[PDB]
Amino acid sequence: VQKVTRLSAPVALAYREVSTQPRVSTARDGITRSGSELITTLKKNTDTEPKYTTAVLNPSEPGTFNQLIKEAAQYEKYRFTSLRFRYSPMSPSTTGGKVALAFDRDAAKPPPNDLASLYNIEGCVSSVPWTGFILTVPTDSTDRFVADGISDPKLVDFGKLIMATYGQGANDAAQLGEVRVEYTVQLKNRTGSTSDAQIGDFAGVKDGPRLVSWSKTKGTAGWEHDCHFLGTGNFSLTLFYEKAPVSGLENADASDFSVLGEAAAGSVQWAGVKVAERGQGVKMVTTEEQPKGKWQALRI
Amino acid sequence: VQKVTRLSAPVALAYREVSTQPRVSTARDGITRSGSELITTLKKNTDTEPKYTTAVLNPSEPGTFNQLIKEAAQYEKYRFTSLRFRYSPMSPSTTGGKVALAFDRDAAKPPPNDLASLYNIEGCVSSVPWTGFILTVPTDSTDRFVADGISDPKLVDFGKLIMATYGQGANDAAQLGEVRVEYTVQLKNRTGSTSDAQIGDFAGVKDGPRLVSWSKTKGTAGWEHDCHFLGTGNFSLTLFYEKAPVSGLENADASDFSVLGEAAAGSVQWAGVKVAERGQGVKMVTTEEQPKGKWQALRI
Amino acid sequence: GITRSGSELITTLKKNTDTEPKYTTAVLNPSEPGTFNQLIKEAAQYEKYRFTSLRFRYSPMSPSTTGGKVALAFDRDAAKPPPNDLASLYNIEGCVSSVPWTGFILTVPTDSTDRFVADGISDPKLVDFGKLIMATYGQGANDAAQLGEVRVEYTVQLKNRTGSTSDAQIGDFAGVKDGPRLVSWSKTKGTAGWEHDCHFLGTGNFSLTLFYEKAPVSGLENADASDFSVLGEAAAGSVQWAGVKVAERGQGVKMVTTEEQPKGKWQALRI
Amino acid sequence: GITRSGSELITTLKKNTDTEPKYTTAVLNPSEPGTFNQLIKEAAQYEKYRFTSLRFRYSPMSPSTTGGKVALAFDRDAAKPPPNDLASLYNIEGCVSSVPWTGFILTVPTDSTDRFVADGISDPKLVDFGKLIMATYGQGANDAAQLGEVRVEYTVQLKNRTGSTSDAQIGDFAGVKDGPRLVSWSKTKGTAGWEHDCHFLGTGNFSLTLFYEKAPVSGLENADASDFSVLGEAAAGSVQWAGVKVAERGQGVKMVTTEEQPKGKWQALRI
């Protein structure tokens, strides 16, 4: 018989969660799977404008799922049934500010610029960093292909999750909380098993799962190589057809290691990449134009 | 009401089989899977002594299974429940001779030398090449680890299948028949997903699934590189620490392709290998001693 | 629109004597010269299609002493390389295989969606339905060169009438392609000349070429069962008129040697 | 044989301020100085063991304003590298994690097999049971340097009596190892000298060395909380007697510089 009209504020709250057992079952068309995953942690921000982190929802996405990749390699089509996102805090009540989660149906779209247009997305949620909240995504009934090669994201992907936080104090906690996913997936058509590696060249051709991305921003060339995961096993090898000024430089990353030379006309390099944070790149190769060659990237 | 005391011989027989649906279900400890696979085809032999083909039964074996590799990467222990082998013919009644199948419990053992000791193995079967027969392997209750790295085959493997044929005519069919497997597998302990590549060096260290093998037979060195599968995606890359006389030669294989040079002190090569028959090797590197370096092999 | 049922023949299978298997692929779209022979004329006046029935049949023509096996399979992704080994081929759902002196039937389930019928640059995941793979691997030396035939039974629906598409192929040497896809042009060396890859089977393929300048040689036959040229080429202004009968895909029957980028016009017509 | 139940302390956790997580591993075998402190004396007189109960407990000692998370997990393969990212860590079955001002209990099921208790060259898949991983990733700057403690509750069975194993470690500079695994010797450069990696925690570690010839310098302290050498080294024949107190694993407390391969003898004793 506590007082309803009066509320109290504690120093901190503790949430306890243990490991859950995934469920796999068979049916007439294919298999159904139920499980849970962890995405990432959140950091503080001392400005008055938000900073965004994004995640694309596809079954063949190494940056989002970890154990669904092995069972998604035997099939071609998918359909989601249930999708929930959960936030878990790690900070006391002295921390002030807000955190926000939103979901959009267009995968190929930049994040919004200001705070006013962020609140115009349907179904957005926001809270204080010392409490938990749940976002539930409704689903439709449409079968889509799995992501391989290069295609329009409007044809194969389901949507994208956006996470943001803007306003904290000068002396505050370094990390805020973590985000988990509960999913239910259906699979349709069996096929032979496929390889897990990314092979491509510099003329916009990709023939594998989405692991890395390339950008030009050409001032005396200079090619950027952005990674999308944290799997710490990234091995990259590159073949040169003509003379290159420099290759295999460390732009901004935790560690770098290269073996062979690059000053030959026909030469193969080999590098190992350690990644600690999302979007960090460990390659910067300058040329005089867009060159001819072949690159291969592999996890573990 | 046919005549029991009289038998007839036809020109040929036809067996028809369609694709079967595998069954996956969950339990308290882990998952159970039921399915079927194809191994290989058989060829003729005009001698009077048999020629043998062998297959090691482990869940993490790329040369034996094709779709069990993806689901065996999430677990650590296994136990078999049912194992059957089936032979299917492709030849008329003009073909004369015998084909034989046997199973042994010691994985690290050479095949027998003569026909008399081949018939001493318990449970061996033999027939004419224009009929079908079934071999059933009884199973025990012992949990074993999956095969990764380098270990004693007496500790991790279950057994090995031996297939043979010896005596055919001069003018005869080129191919005889095919062999299929029906299995039932149980899995126990969940773990994080592992990489599918083989990384090693020349001082007897292997850190992945069994894809290739190396042999010395040192006369002015000369390193052999035998493949165990037919997956046609084999990419091999090798780093040299000192000067090598020659590298990346084609010994006996269908196709070969190499990109970079090998006459440098620090150099990386890159080769693609096409394999049509088991045991064919596409590498032959001569040195003056056992060298220091690093090699990586990857399927697809 | 209209509904039509029918049965058509694709191709005949051949003996394979080497160790590795041989695969042939067929893409199922109504605007395909390599799959259909009579549906392509009614499909040229419409924009959308839907399949309601689909089946495949194998008919033997080999003697009873011929040993081996033939295989048929169907898949959903029209943009995918063919498999390498037999174990990945037998993992596709619904695969069938049999000895070459008997017949069998493959049945494919269908859905209810409307797709565009067109030829162009667009994604095969958007406009195509699937792909058929036929595999032959193991035969001997003293066997017949022909094994059997493959036929298709279908039922289709068409939706929206439009203006008709022309049936002949018009082009020139600097690459411009329009009309039906009947033939491909390839080059290896500018001094050597060009190859004329007919990627369809038929009789009475009429090809005519125009030379705007002098040419060293023209009208060379390479892999044609029959060849007949009636108009010669000489100096600045001349025309040619050639009739080609083709038996198998990609023969490369016509060879002409000129300079790097000559000027002219070529017309290709079927029957 | 005998049956024993008990509770022992392993180690204390520390604050982690950088971006990447920190992992510590512990191998569960009765002949391990880095895991047990009293079971190693009764395990030196037997040959086989079996576990019937196993549990782990975390006890906090940090204030309520300390933010972060601690994690514990157990796995079955004793020969495996630690994971890189957090997502592969949370995929291990039975993992637990909590805020550092509260406690939690991890429970591990057991089986019924007999394994050898020994230290040597043999396979960890044959003689070991499993491995424990403790992870700490996210803390701040104005937080306490100590977080908590980990304890083990167990019940074990021993089978076959044998002769007793000696408790001190005897060795020399050319690599020969026998006795309990208490300390490791490492070298980087022959001119620079050797590093003395004490891979266990304790007090009163007594080390004595013999020099068969002249030495440039000896007895240098690098990362010891306390150091005391009472016997000097001079010319051909001298001995040393050093007492080292060690707080954390792998400090590398003793440094001696000599030539490439000197002759001598070293004895290491705990308490």
Residue by residue, DSSP assigns A146-188 as ---SS--HHHH--EEEEEEE----SS--SEEEEEEEEEEEEE-
Cβ–Cβ of C138/B67 closer than 8 Å? no
Q: Is the dihedral angle over the CA atoms B216, B219, B223, B225 positive or is it negative?
A: negative
Report DSSP letters for C12-65, one per residue: EEE---SSS-EEEEEE--TT-TTT-SSHHHHGGGBSEEEEEEEEEEEEE-S-TT
Cβ–Cβ of B151/D123 closer than 8 Å? yes
Q: Which two tokens stand for residue D90?
A: 């949370």
Paired residues of B210 in beta bridges = none
Q: Is the dihedral angle over the CA atoms D224, D229, D232, D236 positive or is it negative?
A: negative
How far C88 CA sits from the closest chain A CA (Å)?
Answer: 5
Residue A72 phi/psi, 5-degree rounding, is -85, -5
Q: Spell out which residues of chain A touch residue B233, defining contact as CB-CB under 8 Å.
A: 195
Please answer whether residues B245 and B290 qualify as being in contact, where contact means their C-beta atoms are separated by less than 8 angstroms.
no
CA angle C121, C125, C130 (to 5 degrees): 110
- DSSP H helices, D113-267, are 124-127
- Of the residues C22, C66, C95, C97, the best mutation for testing chain B's interface (the one with the most B CB atoms within 10 Å of its CB) is C97
DSSP tag of A72: G
Q: Which two tokens stand for residue D66?
A: 């300390």
Q: Give D201's contacts (C-beta < 8 A, 6+ positions apart).
A: D11, D246, D247, D248, D249
User: How many contacts does B have with D, using Cβ atoms within 8 A?
Assistant: 29
Q: For residues B135 and B122, what is the distance between their CA atoms, to the nearest angstrom?
A: 12
Please answer whether residues A185 and A75 qualify as being in contact, where contact means their C-beta atoms are separated by less than 8 angstroms.
no
Which residue of B lies nearest to D124 if distances are taken between CA atoms? B151
Q: Which two tokens stand for residue C180?
A: 């039906």
Report DSSP letters for A242-292, one per residue: S--SB----SS-SEEEE-S---SSSEEEEEEEE--STT-EEEEEB-SS---
Cβ–Cβ of C69/B90 closer than 8 Å? yes
Q: Which helix (H) or strand (E) holds D40?
A: helix D39-42
- Which chains would you list as touching D if contact means 3+ CB atom pairs under 8 Å? A, B
CB atoms within 10 A of CB C56: 22
Paired residues of D58 in beta bridges = D150
Is D158 strand, coil or helix? strand
CA angle D94, D98, D99 (to 5 degrees): 170
Q: Give B8's contacts (C-beta < 8 A, 6+ positions apart).
A: none
Q: Give D149's contacts (C-beta < 8 A, 6+ positions apart).
A: D9, D10, D11, D12, D13, D58, D59, D61
In which region does residue D235 sit, left (phi positive, over 0), alpha (psi from -120 to 50) or beta (all else)? left
Q: For residues B58 and B108, what is the distance between their CA atoms, to the nearest angstrom?
A: 13
Resolution of the PDB structure in angstroms? 2.9
CA dihedral B235, B240, B245, B247 (to 10 degrees): 0
Q: Spell out which residues of chain A touch residue D88, defining contact as CB-CB under 8 Å.
A: 66
CA dihedral A124, A129, A130, A131 (to 10 degrees): 10
Q: For residues C229 and C246, what is the distance between their CA atoms, to the nearest angstrom?
A: 15
Q: DSSP 3-state helix, strand, coil percentages of chain D (rounded to 5)?
A: 5, 45, 50
Of B74, B239, B259, the CB nearest to A239: B259
Cβ–Cβ of B76/D79 closer than 8 Å? no
Q: Which two tokens stand for residue B229?
A: 């599968």
Q: For residues C130 and C117, what is the distance between their CA atoms, to the nearest angstrom?
A: 14
How far B146 CA sits from the closest chain D CA (Å)?
Answer: 11
Q: How many helices (H) and strands (E) does chain D have?
A: 3, 20
Residue found by looking up tokens 């419409």 in the block: C46
Of C79, C92, C123, the CB nearest to A191: C92
Paired residues of B283 in beta bridges = none
Q: For residues B282 and B271, what is the distance between their CA atoms, to the nearest angstrom?
A: 9
Q: Spell out which residues of chain D touch residue B151, defining contact as CB-CB under 8 Å.
A: 123, 125
CB atoms within 10 A of CB A226: 15
Q: Residue D91 to residues D75, D104, D137: CA-CA distances in angstroms?
A: 11, 19, 17
Cβ–Cβ of C93/A155 closer than 8 Å? no
Residue A247 phi/psi, 5-degree rounding, is -155, 155
Residue found by looking up tokens 């995918």 in the block: C80
DSSP tag of B69: H
Q: For residues C83 and C156, what is the distance between their CA atoms, to the nearest angstrom?
A: 30
Of A145, A191, A193, the CB nearest to C125: A145
Q: For residues C39 and C36, what is the distance between their CA atoms, to the nearest angstrom?
A: 6
CB atoms within 10 A of CB B215: 11
Paired residues of B206 in beta bridges = B200
CB atoms within 10 A of CB D137: 20
The closest alpha carbon to B250, from B219, B220, B271, belongs to B271
Cβ–Cβ of B37/C142 closer than 8 Å? no
Residue found by looking up tokens 């084609």 in the block: B250
Q: For residues B277 and B232, what is the distance between their CA atoms, to the nearest angstrom?
A: 10
DSSP tag of D44: G
Please answer whether residues D85 and D115 qualify as being in contact, where contact means their C-beta atoms are separated by less than 8 angstroms.
no
Q: Spell out which residues of chain C touch residue A155, defining contact as CB-CB under 8 Å.
A: 123, 125-126
CA angle B191, B193, B195 (to 5 degrees): 140
Q: Give B1's contacts (C-beta < 8 A, 6+ positions apart).
A: none
Please answer whether residues A169 and A272 qualify as being in contact, where contact means their C-beta atoms are separated by less than 8 angstroms.
no
Q: Give C240's contacts (C-beta < 8 A, 6+ positions apart).
A: C208, C209, C211, C218, C219, C229, C231, C232, C233
How big is chain D by its Cα radius of gyration, in Å?
A: 21
- Of the residues D66, D75, D86, the best mutation for testing chain A's interface (the one with the most A CB atoms within 10 Å of its CB) is D86
Q: For residues A227 and D231, what is the distance between their CA atoms, to the nearest angstrom?
A: 58
Q: How many helices (H) and strands (E) does chain A have?
A: 3, 19
Q: Spell out which residues of chain B touch residue C15, defining contact as CB-CB under 8 Å.
A: none
How big is chain C by its Cα radius of gyration, in Å?
A: 21
CB atoms within 10 A of CB A21: 12
Residue found by looking up tokens 């043999």 in the block: D122
Residue type, D139: Q
- DSSP H helices, chain B, are 68-71, 115-118, 153-156
Q: Spell out which residues of chain A touch residue C93, defining contact as CB-CB under 8 Å.
A: 189-191
Q: For residues A247 and B126, what is the distance between their CA atoms, to the nearest angstrom?
A: 62
Q: Is the dihedral angle over the CA atoms A146, A152, A157, A161 positive or is it negative?
A: positive
Q: For residues A80 and A102, what is the distance between their CA atoms, to the nearest angstrom?
A: 18
Q: Spell out which residues of chain D touch residue A41, defining contact as CB-CB under 8 Å.
A: 138
Please answer whether residues B201 and B292 qualify as being in contact, where contact means their C-beta atoms are separated by less than 8 angstroms.
yes
Buried b (16+ CB within 10 A) or exposed e, B72-89: bbbbbbbbbeebebbbbb
How big is chain A by its Cα radius of gyration, in Å?
A: 22
Paired residues of C6 in beta bridges = C154
Which residue of B lies nearest to A72 if distances are taken between CA atoms? B70
Cβ–Cβ of B155/D83 closer than 8 Å? no
Number of residues in chain C: 271
The closest alpha carbon to A226, from A217, A236, A214, belongs to A214
* Half-sphere CA count of A118, side-chain side, radius 13 A: 21
How big is chain B by its Cα radius of gyration, in Å?
A: 22
* Half-sphere CA count of C36, side-chain side, radius 13 A: 20
Is B240 strand, coil or helix? strand
Q: For residues A280 and A200, what is the distance between their CA atoms, to the nearest angstrom?
A: 20
Q: For residues D23 and A214, what is the distance between their CA atoms, to the nearest angstrom?
A: 33
Q: Spell out which residues of chain D touch residue B191, defining contact as CB-CB under 8 Å.
A: 75, 77, 91-93
Residue found by looking up tokens 């290069």 in the block: A150
Report DSSP letters for B106-172, one per residue: -SS-PPPSSHHHHTTSTT-EEE-TTS--EEEE------EE---SS--HHHH--EEEEEEE----SS-
Q: Which helix (H) or strand (E) holds D195?
A: strand D194-198
Of C76, C91, C126, the CB nearest to A76: C76
Of A14, A173, A232, the CB nearest to D84: A232
CB atoms within 10 A of CB D133: 18
CA angle B224, B227, B232 (to 5 degrees): 130
The closest alpha carbon to C182, from C200, C195, C166, belongs to C200
Please answer whether residues A280 and A254 qualify as being in contact, where contact means their C-beta atoms are separated by less than 8 angstroms.
yes
The closest alpha carbon to B45, from B177, B175, B179, B161, belongs to B175
How far B191 CA sits from the closest chain D CA (Å)?
Answer: 5
Chain D residues bordering chain B (beta-carbon distance below 8 Å): 75-77, 79, 83, 88-89, 91-93, 123, 125-126
Of D85, D92, D99, the CB nearest to A14: D99
The closest alpha carbon to B155, from B164, B167, B142, B166, belongs to B142
CB atoms within 10 A of CB C239: 13
Q: For residues C53 and C106, what is the distance between their CA atoms, to the nearest angstrom?
A: 12
Buried b (16+ CB within 10 A) or exposed e, D232-245: ebeeeebebebebe
Q: Spell out which residues of chain D touch residue B152, defining contact as CB-CB under 8 Å.
A: 123
* Half-sphere CA count of D262, side-chain side, radius 13 A: 22
Which residue of C lies nearest to A154 if distances are taken between CA atoms? C126
Q: Spell out which residues of chain B touch residue C67, defining contact as CB-CB under 8 Å.
A: 90-92, 173, 175
Q: Spell out which residues of chain A touch residue B235, defining contact as CB-CB under 8 Å.
A: 296
Please answer whether residues C140 and B52 qualify as being in contact, where contact means their C-beta atoms are separated by less than 8 angstroms.
no
Q: Which helix (H) or strand (E) holds D41?
A: helix D39-42
Q: Which helix (H) or strand (E) holds B251?
A: none
User: How many contacts does A have with C, using Cβ atoms within 8 A?
Assistant: 29
Diameter of chain D measured on Cα atoms: 60
The closest alpha carbon to B226, from B214, B235, B238, B241, belongs to B214
* Half-sphere CA count of A25, side-chain side, radius 13 A: 5
Q: Which two tokens stand for residue B275?
A: 């394999």
The closest alpha carbon to C104, from C72, C147, C80, C146, belongs to C72
Q: Which helix (H) or strand (E) holds D13?
A: strand D3-14
Q: Residue C82 to residues A157, B66, C21, C78, C131: CA-CA distances in angstroms?
A: 25, 17, 11, 10, 10
How far C128 CA sits from the closest chain B CA (Å)?
Answer: 25
Q: Which two tokens stand for residue B205?
A: 């260290």
CA angle B180, B181, B183 (to 5 degrees): 160
Q: For residues A42 and A164, what is the distance between their CA atoms, to the nearest angstrom?
A: 9
How far A80 CA sits from the closest chain B CA (Å)?
Answer: 20
Q: Which helix (H) or strand (E) holds D131?
A: strand D131-136
Q: Spell out which residues of chain D touch residue A171, defining contact as CB-CB under 8 Å.
A: 142
CA end-to-end distance (rounded Å), chain C? 28
CA dihedral A143, A145, A146, A152 (to 10 degrees): -120
The closest alpha carbon to D28, from D53, D60, D1, belongs to D53
CA angle B203, B204, B209 (to 5 degrees): 135
The closest alpha carbon to C263, from C216, C193, C213, belongs to C213
Q: For residues C36 and C38, what is the distance between their CA atoms, to the nearest angstrom?
A: 6
Report DSSP letters for chain C, one per residue: --EEEEEEEEEEEE---SSS-EEEEEE--TT-TTT-SSHHHHGGGBSEEEEEEEEEEEEE-S-TT----EEEEEES-SS-PPPSSHHHHTTSTT-EEE-TTS--EEE-------EE---SSS-HHHH---EEEEEE----SSS-SEEEEEEEEEEEEE--B-PPPPSSEEEETTTEEESS--EEEEES-TTT-EEEEE-S-EEEEEEEEEESS--SEEEEESS-SEEEE-S---SSSEE--EEEEE-STT---EEEE--SS--EEEEEEE-
Q: Which two tokens stand for residue C106?
A: 């493959």
Is D42 strand, coil or helix? helix
Residue D50 phi/psi, 5-degree rounding, is -150, 135
Q: Is the dihedral angle over the CA atoms D249, D253, D257, D259 positive or is it negative?
A: negative
Technique employed here was cryo-EM
Q: Which two tokens stand for residue D181?
A: 């695994």
Q: For residues A35 and A24, what is the distance between their CA atoms, to the nearest angstrom?
A: 9
Paired residues of B127 in beta bridges = B99
Please answer whether residues D124 and D31 qualify as being in contact, where contact means their C-beta atoms are separated by less than 8 angstroms.
no
Residue B251, classified by CB atoms within 10 Å of its CB into exposed (0-12), middle (13-18) or buried (19+), is middle
DSSP tag of B246: B
Q: Which two tokens stand for residue C120?
A: 């162009």
Q: Which two tokens stand for residue A74?
A: 């035997």
> Is C in contact with D (3 or more beta carbon pairs below 8 Å)?
no
CA dihedral D40, D45, D47, D53 (to 10 degrees): -50
Please answer whether residues A149 and A206 qualify as being in contact, where contact means their C-beta atoms are separated by less than 8 angstroms.
yes
Q: Give A266's contacts (C-beta < 8 A, 6+ positions apart).
A: A239, A240, A241, B259, B260, B261
DSSP tag of D145: S
Q: Give D223's contacts (C-beta < 8 A, 6+ positions apart).
A: D251, D252, D253
Residue type, B55: A
